[PDB]
A paper describes a structure:
Pyruvate kinase isoform M2 ([name]) converts phosphoenolpyruvate (PEP) to pyruvate and plays an important role in cancer metabolism. [name] exists in a dynamic population of monomer, dimer and tetramer and its pyruvate kinase activity relies on the formation of the tetramer. Upon formation of the tetramer, [name] can adopt the inactive T-state or active R-state conformation.
PKM2R399E also adopts the T-state conformation. No significant difference existed between the structures of PKM2R399E and PKM2Phe. Residue R399 of α14 on monomer C forms hydrogen bonds with residues E396 of α14 and E418 of α15 on monomer D on the C-C′ interface of the PKM2WT structure. However, residue [name] on monomer C may not form the same hydrogen bonds in PKM2R399E even in the R-state (in the presence of PEP or FBP) because the three negatively charged residues may repel one another. The existence of [name] in [name] will inhibit the formation of the R-state conformation induced by FBP or PEP, and lead to a decrease of enzymatic activity (compared to PKM2WT). Consistently, in the presence of FBP, PKM2R399E is less active and has less of a tendency to form a tetramer compared to PKM2WT. Compared to PKM2WT, PKM2R399E showed a decrease in activity in the absence or presence of FBP, with a kcat/Km of 0.6 or 1.8, respectively. PKM2R399E tends to inhibit the formation of R-state tetramer ([name] on monomer A repels E396 on monomer A and E418 on monomer B on the C-C′ interface) and leads to a decrease of activity even in the presence of FBP. In addition, association of tyrosine phosphorylated peptide, acetylation of residue K433 or the mutation of [name] of [name] promotes its protein kinase activity and nuclear localization, which are correlated with predominant dimer formation.
Numbering used by the authors:
A (entry chain C): 24 to 120, 207 to 403, 407 to 519, 522 to 531
B (entry chain B): 24 to 403, 406 to 518, 522 to 531
C (entry chain A): 24 to 126, 130 to 403, 407 to 518, 522 to 531
D (entry chain D): 25 to 117, 216 to 402, 407 to 531
Write the structure that this text describes.
């Protein structure tokens, strides 16, 4: 019941028993564009595929997206094991040119270049799940991106990338305007002194956890795996540290984009993230997040997480349409996996942005009686959890639903049949 | 209020408003051996000077120690600003070593990736090593190694892979190349080796350390408790006050950590050496485990290797290195050790100054109250222990500027440090060795009182206390109107706690 | 944040803000027997009517029950305002008493020597020297040095000599002695039958009269409780058995009694004769504590507002004594003679309501729940804990529980929530029996069962929503907790706004 | 937990801990004799109250003289000697004057008789206290003033009365006349609570063991009522007619001792201290630390070397479970220390030593012997010791953990 005990009980000779709760985002490039490679990367644990729009034509990116969706849908014949895979568009953004950085300067470059405008509407056409907005420095930058996406792209998640000092200084207003945050350590390291970057990372991650908004750590993760089949201990420690800081997702770059071991990189990411999970002290996170929260859905979400610790439940099953209800549960960081059951394929993909959310896509048609339709979706989650090893028959799980059709404030404690 | 809020309130624009609490240990070599440089390293924050006895003669090391003390005592005229500097002897160890590179002896050769290298056991080559043939001192290597086995030379800098085996030789391929010097360390991962706790050379080195009055010993390649006991026995009665710090370098050392920790005065975590047998996805877990158990036991723990290595060639470190050092401090490390960055680098002073910056920056992320509260209910009738607890407890209540401890052996200041107060611990002592060894503990700011002993014990106490407050004011620990805690014994020749206001 | 802040905030110049949570039990006798009086007592806050079977015939008590039910059902036309009223049967129990004085009062002397005989030739010839009683086994449970109290401890004797079937005692404290007076044997392990033949008849009377609960007198051990259980048999197996602890053996063997009982009654008066005065308060706090821990109802009875038999207002000592019983954690307070035969029956009920309601302000609810949760050894009990936890954090006006046997509401009450528990049921018996638990506000639903389950749930929920707003537990805009099952024939918790 | 503490209560188990609440006895015709006073002292009387509603100054002077003859008859053994305080209770007089003419005569007689405390009747506001304070003047500036709360206005303006007073007496019998019965218990709990938080002594009086005037045993209702007063947090309990005029004054004291001792087992100390701590200077910091350390080490006692008694009062506020042995050379503070719960005042009559260190250990060792004799602790046990640092130090800012020799 102390964080000190938790560290003292760490045993490197025992395999990690809990699942890997942090999302994996892989940059797709020449080394990982093929359908066959993408299939194995999905099998190895890739949750999100990022397309870097600093280079490449729209025709080139359209094919990459096509390949990602081909590899993803090849597993669709088994809905119990089917893993949703999101598509992320990463803008080139404003540049100064050999690129130039102006440390501490309030750069007045427009939030969205002419190329970014083209790429953003291309992202709307391609039905991407989220956008990584480069070089975000203020709230008006985020809303300018939102404006370009327009009405047709209103459901596309906007992740603001913090790449300089102004972004760190004005972090609160940026966070309040964004759907999530990406911490670009590499770029941050050239804008502020290196001995202050780790402080910035912990601050931003902390405020994202407090706000219940997804935070992504990017750059300088496993870069040595571009040439090597194994990473250094320092890289394994840095990655783990980002997980323990409270990051929702971790992003790979050249390791999966152009490297010689893209598949080994994804697997090494999965291993490190799963190993770091044993050092995570869940009970303290939840109790602190509770005391820092400012509604029947909020109250039910807290109750579900609270009960998940009391019952030692194998999972928290959440029936959701937009994903919002599952997100509210994720904010409180339960140790138990959050099985988000949805019929919306987009919300299933976007759910990977939140730590601990294991999204499943229900393809069964809507049943006439509401009580029937709820039981159907729950039993679907029951089957997935059994197949994934989350829980077994006889265990207890928490289920969050709505009370009436299109009403979620209902919690029930049910045994696994 | 909460750990999460403490993180949220972190501010890279706000200047550091706290003292740097973690000790800085610098390896002394050709680039930092001079008196002029040593003075500047002390002013920059060096607390302990490590002497690596893997190379160099006793004569060479004696001059280094002399130069350290010359630079140290040049500040001794002002007792208020004087900072004690400890001397550490790092043993060569019982690890397998290569032979002499042919020629003068040193003499280095270039091993290139993909090339063939023949490892021999024929003593005709024990002083004739090069890129083609390599001699090592483990005669039984062919029986303990296999085809496909990997061999690491010079602390993991160079890696080889065995291709085929002979009666008295091995044919290998150079996997990770580099420059090879004479008598370098050889590591055989996953191999069963017969190695003594301490070598014949280590024995004469430990004796040399006693005659040179060193403060601590870094014992290399400790795998079990009996390894520490041997080092203890060699030091014997004459060196019974010399602290023994066990270096954990392999899997067995981690596996048998508890018995080693119990037998040792402290622990060094050699991450780079750990990474030889232990994969990248597990090393960080071993670090947090060993540091945690060291904190729980109240014994010093040092993080070593792979810290600011890029500063050997550059004046600035990478952000990854900054995060790595910081995470070590946040894990709960008492000290951070620099190796080649101060030993042979081009910027030994920038290395010390940067280490000071990073350690001071990381101090803002430390959540003190949770540490003490957990270390309280995790702690194993002793009047000194209860007084120590009470002093730390009161330091949080009164928001004390410091906890002043009057000590002779350091023991009293150590028991306070285990509970990790937010306020600095000013350990006032008349024992010079106590003042130097105190750097091993986080949060302890040792102070050497040179004033003679007053017969009136109450006058002697208030004299030492007034000295501590002058030190505290000068270092900016506290000012007039602040309150401090004072720990003393009750009679002349430690169960007394006093809450006193600063005038 | 602290219990002492709670005590410091206490304001006597401030009206009681919360609803009365403890049950009020009133002994119905000559002064409260009429329908007119009963109606007023019900409106004044009476939850349970106790019938003391020490006095009165079956037909006398049967008429009292009839009047209680006539009074109770006169409010049945308004289902929202209707209050269930339970009926309690209190057995006479076994008892050791003397005999007739030849002639009939005498005068005892302090320090003198009164002889105890068992010869029936003096069963009607008792006086200053010789005296007889009916416990023929008294010379096995009493020994040299034992104490013998006579007539409510008004006369104390100390055993000096043992005999074949006689005792020689010295009058420790004098007084005056009548005939057929009660005898107590402090410390002794009495072997009287668990249930006398009269109690057997009265228990069978309770079954055929459909009483809700029985207060079993003079319970010393687990087998005593099961003997009462046997008499009630199959027909009365749903009747709650509340064991009355009245002597030292009952206190010593309290655990086995509680483990065999549905509830406990603390009889302070009888306790005061059996054990020293400086220990009764400890026993009361102990027994109430273990009952709170076990989640079983506990009733404090005797010596409550006794002065109100002759006066319209109680003393400050009585007001303090009742309040402290409530603050100890008692579920119900029982009124005796001041409602049964006194001159101010409905004043005593109203005053009991006032005292209990004022005592609620000194209760530190959040402390009690956190301790009860942590000291606990099932989907329903996980949902019950979750409901109480949510009620504190939502600052809920109430916890609405759908139950048919009462069980689900009972295990919510165990964790002592601040918010009142509105137990909605169609079973009239569980509605009456629910008064035994602190904070449970039972309502009886008379609406027909809807074939669509989700519609029947909302019907009962809406009924509770109307009751709570009428009682002032909550208003529109507030948030309440709702506990239901998920299918027809309690593991579902819902957070819902008050419409 | 507090709940499990209640569950563990065993009436068959003898009270092991010492009695911590002071006992104040009203002295009258039934208890005036020296030999009866001797027995009351041995039975646990800490304070003798003189009711100046009746009797002449010559009558009360004889009573005070008898109280001191009985007290000093035990003086030949400083180890077992128990200090006994003398209390003057004014007759008293809503715009009636604070001090009547008779009261003024009685208050100045009290100064002349060197009483330790005064129970001021019918206090309704802070100005009433200031008037009593002014009467006692410079000569009686060290005499503790205990304001008696007897009416509704006194309860209303309680905060300002508490601030001006040295202590509070809850006159429950008189309270019951002016305010409804379903509110008196709330007022008592409120006043006791605020007194505990402020760290000032609170006394519950009237309607205690009244039935013991004519009977040797109290009713269970009285036993329960007295016990709950203790459990509310009262520092002292006061007997009236039971000791003043009753047939069993000695039995009344012994019963009050038993009840208070039995109620001690129901007290949940760690909750009190933790709440008192979170609802709060070198000494005040040392006081908290000593109480906290006493719980950790399971200390047999907290030894406090004090001159004015204030240091012991600071420790007493935080309600430690361990007995507070207050070692003083001042006979007055030794008698006044009984007003505070958990303080066991002891009077050192050893000559002052030249070396201040020697004089400290002398007094500490005195407490060691007193503790062993009283059964608070034994050889091998550990106690907390609070002292000043040097001669002249008013601050008890020095805490030491020391094994019992
Ligand atoms: Mg960029
Ligand atoms: Mg090595
Ligand atoms: Mg009876």
């Amino acid at each position: 019941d102390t964080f000190l005990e938790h560290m003292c009980r760490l045993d490197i000779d025992s395999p990690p028993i809990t699942a890997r709760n942090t999302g994996i985002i892989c940059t797709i490039g020449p080394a990982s564009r093929s359908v066959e490679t993408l299939k194995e990367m999905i099998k190895s644990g890739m949750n999100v595929a990022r397309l870097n729009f600093s280079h490449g034509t729209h025709e080139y990116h359209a094919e990459t997206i096509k390949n990602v969706r081909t590899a993803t849908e090849s597993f669709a014949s088994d809905p119990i094991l089917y893993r949703p895979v999101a598509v992320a568009l990463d803008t080139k953004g404003p540049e100064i040119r050999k690129g130039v950085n102006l440390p501490g300067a309030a750069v007045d470059l427009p939030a969205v270049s002419e190329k970014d405008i083209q790429d953003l509407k291309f992202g709307v056409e391609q039905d991407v799940d989220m956008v990584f907005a480069s070089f975000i420095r203020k709230a008006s930058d985020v809303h300018e991106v939102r404006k370009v996406l327009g009405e047709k792209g209103k459901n596309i998640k906007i992740i603001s990338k913090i790449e300089n000092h102004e972004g760190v200084r004005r972090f609160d207003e940026i966070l309040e305007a964004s759907d999530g945050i990406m911490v670009a350590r590499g770029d941050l390291g050239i804008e502020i002194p290196a001995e202050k970057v780790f402080l910035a990372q912990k601050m931003m991650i902390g405020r994202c956890n407090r706000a219940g908004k997804p935070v992504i750590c990017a750059t300088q993760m496993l870069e040595s795996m571009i040439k090597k089949p194994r990473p250094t201990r320092a890289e394994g420690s840095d990655v783990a540290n980002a997980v323990l800081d409270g990051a929702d997702c971790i992003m790979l770059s050249g390791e999966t984009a152009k490297g010689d071991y893209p598949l080994e990189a994804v697997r090494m990411q999965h291993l490190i993230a799963r190993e770091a999970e044993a050092a995570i002290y869940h009970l303290q996170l939840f109790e602190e997040l509770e005391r820092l929260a400012p509604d029947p859905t909020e109250a039910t979400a807290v109750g579900a997480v609270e009960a998940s610790f009391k019952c030692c439940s194998g999972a928290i099953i959440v029936l959701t349409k937009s994903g919002r209800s599952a997100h509210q549960v994720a904010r409180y960081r339960p140790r138990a996996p959050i099985i988000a059951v949805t019929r919306n394929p987009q919300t299933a993909r976007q759910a990977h942005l939140y730590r601990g959310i294991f999204p499943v896509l229900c393809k069964d048609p809507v049943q006439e009686a509401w009580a029937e339709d709820v039981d159907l979706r729950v039993n679907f989650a029951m089957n997935v959890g059994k197949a994934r090893g989350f829980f077994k028959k006889g265990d207890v799980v928490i289920v969050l639903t709505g009370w009436r059709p299109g009403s979620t404030n209902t919690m029930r404690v049910v045994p696994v049949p």
